[PDB]
Design a protein around this ligand. Structure first.
Ligand SMILES: Cc1cc2nc3c(=O)[nH]c(=O)nc-3n(C[C@H](O)[C@H](O)[C@H](O)COP(=O)(O)OP(=O)(O)OC[C@H]3O[C@@H](n4cnc5c(N)ncnc54)[C@H](O)[C@@H]3O)c2cc1C
Ligand SMILES: [Cl-]
Ligand SMILES: [Cl-]
Ligand SMILES: [Cl-]
Ligand SMILES: [Cl-]
Ligand SMILES: [Cl-]
Ligand SMILES: [Cl-]
Ligand SMILES: [Cl-]
Ligand SMILES: [Cl-]
Ligand SMILES: [Cl-]
Ligand SMILES: [Cl-]
Ligand SMILES: [Cl-]
Ligand SMILES: [Cl-]
Ligand SMILES: [Cl-]
Ligand SMILES: [Cl-]
Ligand SMILES: [Cl-]
Ligand SMILES: [Cl-]
Ligand SMILES: [Mg+2]
Length: 246
């Protein structure tokens, strides 16, 4: 039949004026792997608008949750700003994406590097019980500009205290819980992330996932290549998986 279903907005939560999470109804048939993204849409007049969002809720949850940043003059953002419980939202029947951590072998140290809304797929991955079982440590570094944008900080700091480590990074504001004033590629170069994790990072033992703004993803990838890491490919184990967050 159609390539999508009509779902309902269940609720919208403002964490700041411009950062929302929201939940939608989940059809019985909708399957995804943690780390993948949905395509969400609205009827607009006689046409459509569609955008991709990483699922932030657990694979086993009974709803689908998403984390969206509201962009000035952005067309989907204007619709998100007006939507409310009971409104129709369209859900593409297929989930997509290759941020699939179980393609890395058990026993490694998993290091997730993200910016902004790029934390979203890693939230779903952290809800998989087997991820902290399979990997020796699970580490999440979330870079934003200002500490107000660390909207999962209280939750992830509490989970932090097979260890889970959370390192917040604020690139434009000085936060005397994490690291401040520098972006993730620089913090890899100067060993600050390794020091914050209290875990030596090596190509043999570390496996990276990257999700963030395109410039950060590129700069982080190139930095890791300089440090001796390689992309995961079909036949290459490698140490890096990456996806642009927009
Ligand atoms: C695979 C994939 C996964 C995505 N996952 C998410 C997600 O989990 N959460 C989310 O909020 N967005 C996500 N995005 C972006 C999302 O699809 C939209 O682009 C976003 O909601 C803005 O839509 P818009 O129509 O208001 O603006 P658009 O017309 O789509 O974009 C306008 C401009 O806003 C900027 N922009 C867009 N999205 C972002 C963002 N998230 N952070 C910073 N700047 C941005 C870009 O400069 C873009 O050119 C994803 C995109 C892709 C391709
Ligand atoms: Cl609502
Ligand atoms: Cl599923
Ligand atoms: Cl959930
Ligand atoms: Cl903006
Ligand atoms: Cl509606
Ligand atoms: Cl797979
Ligand atoms: Cl970002
Ligand atoms: Cl956060
Ligand atoms: Cl500034
Ligand atoms: Cl700038
Ligand atoms: Cl400051
Ligand atoms: Cl960064
Ligand atoms: Cl090594
Ligand atoms: Cl960018
Ligand atoms: Cl390459
Ligand atoms: Cl290959
Ligand atoms: Mg499964």
């Amino acid at each position: 039949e159609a390539k999508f279903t009509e779902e309902k907005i269940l609720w919208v939560k403002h964490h700041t004026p411009k950062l929302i999470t929201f939940a939608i109804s989940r059809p019985e048939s909708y399957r995804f792997k943690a780390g993948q993204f949905s395509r969400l849409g609205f009827y607009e007049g006689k046409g459509f608008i569609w955008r991709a969002y990483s699922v932030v809720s657990a694979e086993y949850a009974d709803t689908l949750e998403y984390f969206a940043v509201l962009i000035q003059d952005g067309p989907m953002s204007a619709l998100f700003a007006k939507m409310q419980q009971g409104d129709t939202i369209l859900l593409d029947k297929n989930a997509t994406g290759f941020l699939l951590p179980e393609r890395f072998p058990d026993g490694k140290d998993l290091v997730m590097l993200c910016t902004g809304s790029g934390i979203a797929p890693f939230l779903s991955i952290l809800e998989q019980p087997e991820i902290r079982q399979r990997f020796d440590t699970v580490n999440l570094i979330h870079s934003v500009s200002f500490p107000e944008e660390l909207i999962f900080n209280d939750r992830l700091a509490a989970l932090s205290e097979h260890s889970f480590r959370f390192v917040p990074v604020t690139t434009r504001a000085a936060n005397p819980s994490g690291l401040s004033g520098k972006r993730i590629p620089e913090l890899l170069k100067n060993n600050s992330i390794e020091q914050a994790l209290h875990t030596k990072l090596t190509p043999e033992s570390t496996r990276f996932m990257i999700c963030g703004n395109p410039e950060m993803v590129k700069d982080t990838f190139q930095t890791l290549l300089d440090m001796g890491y390689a992309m995961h490919r079909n036949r290459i184990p490698g140490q890096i998986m990456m996806e642009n967050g927009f």
